[PDB]
Amino acid sequence: EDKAAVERSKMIEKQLQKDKQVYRRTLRLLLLGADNSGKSTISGIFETKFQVDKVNFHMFDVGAQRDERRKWIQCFNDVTAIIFVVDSSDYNRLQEALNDFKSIWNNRWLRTISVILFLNKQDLLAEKVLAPEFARYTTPEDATPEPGEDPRVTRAKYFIRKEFVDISTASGDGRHICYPHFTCDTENARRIFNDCKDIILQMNLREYNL
Amino acid sequence: ELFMPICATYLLIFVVGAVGNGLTCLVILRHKAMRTPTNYYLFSLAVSDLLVLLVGLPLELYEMWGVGGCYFRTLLFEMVCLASVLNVTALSVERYVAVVHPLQARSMVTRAHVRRVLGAVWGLAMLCSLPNTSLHGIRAVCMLVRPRALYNMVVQTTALLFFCLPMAIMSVLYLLIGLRLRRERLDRGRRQVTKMLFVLVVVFGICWAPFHADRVMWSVVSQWTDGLHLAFQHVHVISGIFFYLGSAANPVLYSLMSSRFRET
Amino acid sequence: FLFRPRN
Amino acid sequence: ELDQLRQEAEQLKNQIRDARKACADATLSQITNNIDPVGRIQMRTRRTLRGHLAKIYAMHWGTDSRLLVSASQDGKLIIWDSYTTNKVHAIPLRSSWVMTCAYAPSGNYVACGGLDNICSIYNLKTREGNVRVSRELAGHTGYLSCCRFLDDNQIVTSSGDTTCALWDIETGQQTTTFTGHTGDVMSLSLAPDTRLFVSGACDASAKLWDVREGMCRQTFTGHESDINAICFFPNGNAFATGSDDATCRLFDLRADQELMTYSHDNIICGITSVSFSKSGRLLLAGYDDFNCNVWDALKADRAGVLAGHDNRVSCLGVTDDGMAVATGSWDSFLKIWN
Amino acid sequence: VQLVESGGGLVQPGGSRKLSCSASGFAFSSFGMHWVRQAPEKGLEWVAYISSGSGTIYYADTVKGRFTISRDDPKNTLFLQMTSLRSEDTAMYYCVRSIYYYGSSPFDFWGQGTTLTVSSSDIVMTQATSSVPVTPGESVSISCRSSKSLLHSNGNTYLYWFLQRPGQSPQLLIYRMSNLASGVPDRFSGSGSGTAFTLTISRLEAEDVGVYYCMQHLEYPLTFGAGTKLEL
Amino acid sequence: TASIAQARKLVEQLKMEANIDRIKVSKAAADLMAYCEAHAKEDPLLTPVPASENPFR
């Protein structure tokens, strides 16, 4: 009868193996961001699933939690990238979102994890700028805008973007990298796909001793 | 006199390469708690380079002054050399997938995969060790019993082909790696990586061309004219210096130049 | 003196 | 007015402090100088359980101290036969980020929960032959940090929403909610008789709760950081805690104050789990450093170490008969020690 | 939970017949299935086995080679292909589920069975008496003895008790010595010395009337004791 | 308002905690030591069992 229990345990092992294959090849993305951020667009945790080019992504929209993160954030050292979404057009909260990004980035545990930073709601940002660095910032020509964009919109949105990259670069030397983007947007799956490929490539470069 | 500079150079190379490989393996043995299966390629490499500096070199040193003895020795030598070559080539291919298909490398590389490919590496080293292995026995000196100019000549040329072939393979794969890292360049990583890969191909060439050239020449000589004898003397001493220098430098280039290692 | 190849 | 209420609060606090200090005549160490030390304890890994795909977060022993359940963030509950190391059951959970699991003392149910804020009870002994969810306990507003069965119909939970709750599983409602905490609650321990339990919270305070009256009988505040682990002494009169500040501390429910502290200057890492051995002489502790330590609960001499883990020791548990210790770890393996 | 055996009927000797049993209301794939036989007015007799996931199959040497046991997990069906049926093979064939893990109850559930009519050094289970007439309210202690110690080195005794009521399939009473099955009242009890065992019906009721069969599971070309039938 | 209600609740619970009875740590520690000695032999981790009674090996 013990032999029958062992055959049961080995059937279970076969099933666990069939799981482990799907566990490795899927990428896990932690989706953070304030309430203002329209992160929905792309009880607690919502474990959304999607795929790109036969690479399957597991995106965990953690939520319905006490405003503190110190504890439950330790769970996500296994993720490839945190996706931090911020509604750029809420100028007043934006400093709070900035401190939130600081608290994530310099988190003791996330130190290894890159951040895919979506500066969301570019459309409202532009329409507001048409209708926050009011004095002394102008776009560095190293980055150039898409056609049709009012240089006011460009200088403002690159000011905001710089503000996040500034925190990203003042600490976390090269262990992890923030990947800022502007979005509203069907391509957001593709941006994540590309930045995840890049994160994995850099992880290999570190790992293979290249 | 004749052998003192040779003694000094070979003994320095011996001790330096021994320290290098010892350090490399020693920090890898943290795999019990701190090193991931990708490091087993590095460990196999450091082993093959160590055995090149433990086998071969000390006997070449003390041969400044039996049959079954030289059958295990010669097999060990050939297998250790070709295991080093196949370590380098397999490292080159894994680094190709690591960079050109970054996701599949992450998923596929597992201890159950790494041990399998390392087994393949050492198995092929064995299977390519034999044809030259059994030709050698006592004669006073470990020397060919079988004909030197017909069977050995083709064996040496074939192992030379097995050096030219991975040379080209790793040149092409590092070329593609460089092209991809260029595309993603178009900050330091992408460039220093390509420089190190070029250096790796250059040093593999510098270190395995003398090794094969030496014994291929020895095989092709129909008769040993005195000037030909002296020329071969030069060839052998220089080739020894270069080849053992390569097996000494492998630990540095492959492990200890890595930022992942520097944090002792 | 007389050398012997690497095998 | 708020000022007057807060002043009354402070004077009450000082009254409590003074009473506790007046009771604090001797010290546990001051008595145990004469106790014969435990000396070294060495325990060897007797088993290793290698099923889990990812970091193991919790384990619990069945009352028949041979079966064992553990949870890992890959979304799996596994029931292990601790003798043969067979996997009795593998349970796919609906939420991947489970942070705690528990074993019914009757052995019929296991509970698990986590970032989904739901404590799911699973029926192990269905007639259909599979393991099905019996009920889902949804009422919490925060991640579930710990749950412990009182019996097949009553389970206590701890949550990041700062409340511990008692549930009636037949219905699925909360019977009584325990609120007095201020930070996220982290661990539970039911008294041996299950009339009282103690909970640790991120406010570095430990509380003693009446399961029936529903009210906080005492609060303890010795630690300097979030309490990750709490465990009752086998006689039910004292409990240990484990804190991110690297110290374990023993409190006495009849002395109403801290009794002993367990720390070593070399230990900088936070404690993840604590548990007493059957007689209560040994206090084990899990750490972010990958080693678990054994403390003489009376002498505070670090009697030993359980060294055989290569990542965060996330969970720990002694069998009901004391014949073994299990430890789970973020390396995804459970080692059984003895 | 419901097992419905199908096929059989009447066969010309030397022919072939295939039983089909359709399971329902339980996780068919995770249960190990047995086929059990009972010749008319005879005792129970093991026929076959096929573990979960078809990895293991056993046969009684009486049918070894002649019978093939197969299952269809996706269709929750159990089969038994019979190749050259002899007169001996006439019997009701019962499908039985069994699941083996620490603390499981094998053989707990038996199908309604289907009838087939045809025109050494193993364990032997001995039951003392064919019959025992006793009045309601009395206690009874049916007894069994085995040619081998069923106490295993792991510390548990692989003796099973089944009760076949008149016109019904057997139902498990005690799956290991003293392990009272599920759904049976605490009146039934069991114990033994590792070679002799006794089913104590602590307080008899009129519902108990029927034949009690012991069965071993220590090492299995599985085999049953002969029936003991209570009377009143 | 709730804030003053919260403070009132805090002071009431602090009173509830204060009135509880307490014994000197000397006696409590003595009782804990007495229990720790009373069950010392049954502790298989404190006093390792022989391999005959160890169910794991």
Side-chain angles (χ1 to χ4, degrees), chain A, chain B, chain C, chain D, chain E residues 1-120 122-232, chain F:
Chain A
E1 229 168 46
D2 289 340
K3 301 181 176 184
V6 177
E7 176 155 77
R8 185 166 202 268
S9 174
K10 285 164 192 170
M11 287 267 293
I12 280 161
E13 285 278 22
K14 292 172 196 164
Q15 185 45 45
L16 288 179
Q17 285 279 15
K18 283 190 178 177
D19 288 353
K20 193 170 186 183
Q21 292 163 356
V22 177
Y23 186 73
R24 277 188 277 97
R25 64 194 64 253
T26 44
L27 305 166
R28 288 164 287 285
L29 307 161
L30 168 54
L31 173 45
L32 302 180
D35 296 318
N36 319 64
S37 51
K39 53 158 166 185
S40 71
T41 309
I42 299 147
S43 63
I45 182 58
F46 315 95
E47 308 180 28
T48 291
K49 275 290 193 77
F50 66 91
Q51 56 170 353
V52 184
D53 305 3
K54 304 182 175 185
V55 186
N56 303 331
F57 299 84
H58 208 166
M59 188 164 43
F60 311 109
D61 182 4
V62 65
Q65 305 296 326
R66 188 180 173 255
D67 62 23
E68 183 53 64
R69 283 224 189 84
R70 73 186 66 266
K71 285 304 195 187
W72 62 260
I73 193 61
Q74 303 166 19
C75 297
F76 303 89
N77 308 154
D78 200 69
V79 298
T80 71
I82 291 165
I83 307 186
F84 184 111
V85 184
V86 58
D87 172 15
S88 51
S89 63
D90 278 346
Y91 307 132
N92 198 97
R93 285 278 196 173
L94 202 65
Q95 173 56 225
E96 302 178 45
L98 191 66
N99 312 146
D100 196 2
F101 186 107
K102 196 176 295 83
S103 297
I104 288 159
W105 182 265
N106 301 273
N107 179 264
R108 171 196 150 191
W109 304 81
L110 307 177
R111 73 202 313 106
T112 54
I113 292 159
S114 293
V115 177
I116 300 176
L117 164 58
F118 282 2
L119 307 165
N120 199 25
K121 288 162 171 181
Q122 60 178 351
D123 181 6
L124 282 58
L125 174 55
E127 81 191 348
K128 285 195 176 189
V129 169
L130 297 172
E133 185 37 298
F134 316 104
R136 64 269 210 276
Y137 179 91
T138 180
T139 300
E141 289 160 23
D142 306 14
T144 67
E146 297 299 312
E149 178 173 303
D150 174 17
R152 290 288 194 84
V153 175
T154 309
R155 78 182 195 96
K157 82 182 198 179
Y158 276 86
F159 164 67
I160 289 165
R161 168 163 162 169
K162 175 272 194 72
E163 202 79 330
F164 287 116
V165 181
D166 193 73
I167 300 178
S168 182
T169 49
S171 180
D173 45 78
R175 195 68 172 176
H176 49 301
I177 299 102
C178 172
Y179 298 65
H181 305 257
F182 305 107
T183 179
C184 300
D185 187 359
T186 57
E187 309 309 303
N188 280 344
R190 214 75 202 191
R191 300 187 214 271
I192 301 159
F193 175 65
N194 290 332
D195 295 14
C196 280
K197 269 172 69 190
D198 198 88
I199 294 158
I200 298 306
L201 184 144
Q202 186 66 224
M203 282 177 61
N204 294 348
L205 262 54
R206 177 208 311 178
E207 180 152 79
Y208 278 84
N209 282 267
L210 294 167
Chain B
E1 287 293 351
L2 179 52
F3 306 85
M4 176 49 51
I6 301 176
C7 171
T9 51
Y10 279 45
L11 190 47
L12 179 153
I13 285 171
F14 164 83
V15 62
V16 176
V19 167
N21 284 264
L23 190 165
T24 292
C25 294
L26 181 139
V27 305
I28 288 173
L29 287 163
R30 286 183 200 172
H31 69 73
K32 290 289 292 195
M34 186 256 189
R35 300 305 189 180
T36 54
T38 300
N39 283 31
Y40 290 176
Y41 299 111
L42 265 57
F43 191 81
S44 171
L45 178 70
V47 169
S48 287
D49 309 323
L50 178 59
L51 296 180
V52 161
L53 304 171
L54 296 190
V55 184
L57 169 55
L59 312 184
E60 186 181 343
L61 266 163
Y62 305 151
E63 281 197 46
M64 181 170 60
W65 296 292
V67 172
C70 208
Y71 277 133
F72 295 156
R73 167 181 167 174
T74 191
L75 177 70
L76 250 179
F77 185 87
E78 292 298 309
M79 176 161 176
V80 156
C81 287
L82 265 67
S84 192
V85 163
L86 275 305
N87 273 332
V88 169
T89 304
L91 262 171
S92 96
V93 180
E94 297 294 2
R95 295 170 160 186
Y96 165 79
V97 184
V99 180
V100 182
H101 298 88
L103 303 176
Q104 298 161 43
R106 171 176 156 280
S107 59
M108 293 202 69
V109 165
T110 323
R111 185 176 296 184
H113 173 280
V114 165
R115 283 174 82 83
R116 162 181 274 175
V117 73
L118 289 175
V121 157
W122 290 94
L124 280 185
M126 185 80 75
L127 273 58
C128 295
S129 311
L130 266 55
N132 206 18
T133 289
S134 285
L135 307 183
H136 293 74
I138 297 293
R139 168 63 72 174
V141 269
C142 180
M143 246 284 106
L144 282 175
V145 186
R146 285 286 186 274
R148 77 174 202 273
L150 290 167
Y151 309 172
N152 161 81
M153 182 266 288
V154 62
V155 169
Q156 297 307 339
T157 48
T158 306
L160 181 142
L161 281 203
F162 298 160
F163 134 81
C164 181
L165 181 139
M167 182 66 164
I169 288 293
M170 81 179 65
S171 172
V172 169
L173 265 44
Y174 290 1
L175 169 58
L176 293 174
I177 286 180
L179 286 190
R180 179 60 58 91
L181 292 172
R182 167 173 174 252
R183 180 177 313 288
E184 296 167 4
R185 185 219 306 167
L186 179 61
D187 315 316
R188 313 181 174 185
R190 289 155 303 203
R191 47 181 175 265
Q192 298 174 343
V193 167
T194 306
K195 174 184 292 189
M196 181 55 70
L197 296 190
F198 165 89
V199 166
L200 286 180
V201 188
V202 167
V203 173
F204 172 102
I206 279 170
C207 300
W208 292 90
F211 177 92
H212 293 286
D214 168 63
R215 50 194 213 180
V216 169
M217 175 182 179
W218 191 86
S219 79
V220 169
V221 168
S222 75
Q223 55 80 4
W224 282 108
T225 300
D226 189 2
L228 186 58
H229 174 202
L230 183 65
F232 179 87
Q233 288 189 348
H234 304 163
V235 161
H236 186 268
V237 171
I238 297 169
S239 171
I241 290 174
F242 280 169
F243 169 93
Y244 298 124
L245 184 61
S247 280
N250 266 10
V252 170
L253 303 177
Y254 282 82
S255 66
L256 199 52
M257 291 277 286
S258 187
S259 54
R260 173 179 163 98
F261 270 71
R262 189 150 60 267
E263 307 163 353
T264 50
Chain C
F1 199 93
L2 184 280
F3 280 102
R4 29 190 179 276
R6 295 158 196 287
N7 276 311
Chain D
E1 272 292 352
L2 286 178
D3 290 320
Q4 194 68 239
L5 287 164
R6 293 178 286 197
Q7 277 294 357
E8 174 69 322
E10 181 65 4
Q11 82 78 5
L12 281 166
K13 187 192 292 177
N14 281 270
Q15 177 210 0
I16 292 164
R17 179 190 52 73
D18 187 58
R20 291 171 177 181
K21 189 51 56 67
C23 295
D25 50 1
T27 77
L28 177 64
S29 47
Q30 182 185 132
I31 294 165
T32 64
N33 280 322
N34 305 330
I35 293 289
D36 189 324
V38 169
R40 194 210 66 261
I41 288 177
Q42 268 186 340
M43 286 164 61
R44 186 168 297 103
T45 297
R46 307 292 177 177
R47 300 289 200 288
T48 292
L49 318 167
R50 298 176 192 272
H52 277 306
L53 310 187
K55 301 155 74 195
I56 277 166
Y57 260 91
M59 53 70 52
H60 203 235
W61 285 105
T63 298
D64 176 11
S65 72
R66 169 180 174 164
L67 284 184
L68 159 79
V69 56
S70 70
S72 63
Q73 71 173 45
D74 56 314
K76 210 73 70 182
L77 269 184
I78 291 177
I79 296 166
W80 301 98
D81 188 354
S82 64
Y83 294 178
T84 73
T85 66
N86 300 115
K87 286 172 262 298
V88 191
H89 305 95
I91 307 168
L93 310 177
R94 288 162 176 161
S95 164
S96 306
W97 299 100
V98 290
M99 297 171 63
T100 188
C101 75
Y103 218 143
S106 82
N108 310 102
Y109 308 98
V110 289
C112 72
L115 291 191
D116 61 353
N117 302 345
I118 289 163
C119 184
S120 291
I121 287 90
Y122 285 84
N123 199 10
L124 299 178
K125 307 214 177 171
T126 74
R127 299 199 62 167
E128 282 65 38
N130 55 31
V131 176
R132 293 193 272 84
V133 188
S134 195
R135 194 156 307 286
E136 298 178 341
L137 306 182
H140 265 305
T141 66
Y143 66 88
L144 274 152
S145 71
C146 193
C147 54
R148 282 280 167 283
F149 273 98
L150 298 155
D151 57 70
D152 273 15
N153 193 41
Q154 288 187 323
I155 189 169
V156 188
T157 56
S158 171
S159 179
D161 69 66
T162 309
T163 62
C164 320
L166 175 58
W167 304 72
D168 171 300
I169 295 169
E170 172 59 47
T171 55
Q173 310 306 126
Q174 292 205 358
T175 285
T176 172
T177 306
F178 308 83
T179 56
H181 267 312
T182 59
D184 306 85
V185 194
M186 295 308 294
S187 45
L188 288 168
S189 197
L190 282 44
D193 62 73
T194 67
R195 296 174 308 91
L196 310 175
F197 74 99
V198 288
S199 65
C202 275
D203 66 355
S205 68
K207 274 181 161 47
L208 175 71
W209 303 96
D210 184 296
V211 181
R212 301 90 182 280
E213 304 295 324
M215 37 73 70
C216 174
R217 297 191 169 280
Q218 313 183 26
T219 292
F220 310 88
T221 57
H223 279 275
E224 300 133 271
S225 282
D226 307 356
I227 297 176
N228 290 318
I230 197 166
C231 183
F232 247 116
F233 194 77
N235 91 336
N237 308 141
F239 64 97
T241 49
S243 166
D244 273 334
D245 65 85
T247 73
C248 303
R249 292 159 183 269
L250 183 81
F251 306 92
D252 178 286
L253 267 68
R254 201 155 52 266
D256 185 51
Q257 62 189 287
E258 172 174 282
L259 213 71
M260 197 75 150
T261 166
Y262 314 103
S263 183
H264 197 290
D265 303 74
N266 177 78
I267 306 174
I268 56 179
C269 42
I271 290 148
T272 56
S273 50
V274 314
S275 309
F276 281 91
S277 195
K278 194 185 196 307
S279 55
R281 184 61 183 262
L282 302 179
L283 170 57
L284 290 82
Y287 292 92
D288 282 11
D289 72 29
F290 314 158
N291 288 11
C292 138
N293 308 136
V294 186
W295 301 84
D296 185 343
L298 315 177
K299 289 303 310 308
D301 309 326
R302 203 179 80 164
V305 180
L306 282 63
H309 273 290
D310 65 66
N311 204 323
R312 187 174 205 192
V313 163
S314 51
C315 43
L316 181 138
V318 183
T319 55
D320 283 352
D321 69 348
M323 201 60 66
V325 181
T327 67
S329 152
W330 280 8
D331 72 275
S332 64
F333 298 149
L334 284 133
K335 305 299 187 64
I336 297 158
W337 305 74
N338 202 351
Chain E
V1 183
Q2 161 169 347
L3 301 162
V4 172
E5 288 95 329
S6 302
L10 173 63
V11 163
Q12 172 73 18
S16 306
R17 187 57 48 82
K18 166 162 69 63
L19 303 173
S20 313
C21 178
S22 193
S24 66
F26 71 100
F28 183 80
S29 177
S30 71
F31 279 88
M33 310 298 292
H34 309 254
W35 279 101
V36 179
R37 164 166 63 186
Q38 180 179 27
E41 74 262 12
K42 302 301 297 300
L44 299 175
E45 185 190 317
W46 184 64
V47 177
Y49 168 54
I50 179 174
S51 71
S52 67
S54 321
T56 298
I57 300 168
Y58 295 157
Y59 294 88
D61 48 352
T62 314
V63 300
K64 183 74 179 172
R66 306 193 291 116
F67 292 173
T68 310
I69 190 178
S70 53
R71 67 190 304 169
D72 184 351
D73 282 352
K75 299 200 71 171
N76 300 333
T77 298
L78 192 70
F79 302 110
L80 193 65
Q81 178 63 61
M82 303 165 146
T83 315
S84 189
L85 286 167
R86 312 197 292 242
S87 175
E88 174 188 34
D89 304 345
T90 181
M92 290 213 70
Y93 287 89
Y94 296 110
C95 193
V96 189
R97 70 180 208 176
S98 72
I99 192 158
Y100 308 95
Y101 54 79
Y102 179 67
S104 65
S105 68
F107 281 82
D108 62 8
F109 186 85
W110 298 57
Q112 293 293 18
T114 188
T115 309
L116 173 69
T117 60
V118 190
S119 187
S120 62
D122 74 21
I123 311 192
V124 175
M125 299 301 297
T126 179
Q127 268 172 241
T129 167
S130 316
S131 176
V132 173
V134 161
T135 68
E138 286 188 63
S139 68
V140 180
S141 301
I142 306 178
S143 55
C144 286
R145 167 64 151 80
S146 61
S147 75
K148 189 172 173 175
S149 185
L150 297 176
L151 161 52
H152 197 278
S153 73
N154 66 33
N156 42 74
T157 317
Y158 295 79
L159 174 91
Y160 293 61
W161 285 101
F162 303 81
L163 166 63
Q164 187 168 22
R165 301 190 170 93
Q168 300 181 35
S169 58
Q171 68 146 0
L172 172 80
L173 294 186
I174 293 182
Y175 47 91
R176 295 170 207 97
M177 193 179 60
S178 203
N179 278 125
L180 186 65
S182 180
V184 294
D186 178 54
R187 312 186 283 97
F188 298 84
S189 162
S191 46
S193 58
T195 46
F197 326 90
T198 65
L199 176 78
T200 287
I201 303 95
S202 306
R203 286 178 296 278
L204 190 138
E205 291 184 0
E207 67 189 14
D208 294 63
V209 63
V211 191
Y212 295 76
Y213 297 94
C214 70
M215 195 197 72
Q216 60 95 20
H217 218 289
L218 187 80
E219 165 205 11
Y220 64 105
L222 212 79
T223 188
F224 294 84
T228 292
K229 74 187 309 192
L230 266 53
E231 296 294 354
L232 75 177
Chain F
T1 58
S3 52
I4 77 178
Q6 173 46 227
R8 191 174 307 97
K9 192 67 178 176
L10 174 58
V11 294
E12 293 289 314
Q13 199 286 314
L14 280 160
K15 278 194 299 303
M16 181 175 293
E17 170 172 5
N19 301 341
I20 189 169
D21 204 345
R22 300 175 172 75
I23 71 177
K24 301 197 292 158
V25 297
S26 61
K27 180 164 67 180
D31 285 311
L32 204 73
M33 186 269 293
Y35 179 94
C36 186
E37 64 175 11
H39 292 58
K41 60 173 70 65
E42 290 87 342
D43 181 318
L45 300 176
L46 188 70
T47 60
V49 289
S52 55
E53 295 190 3
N54 179 342
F56 286 98
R57 179 67 65 184

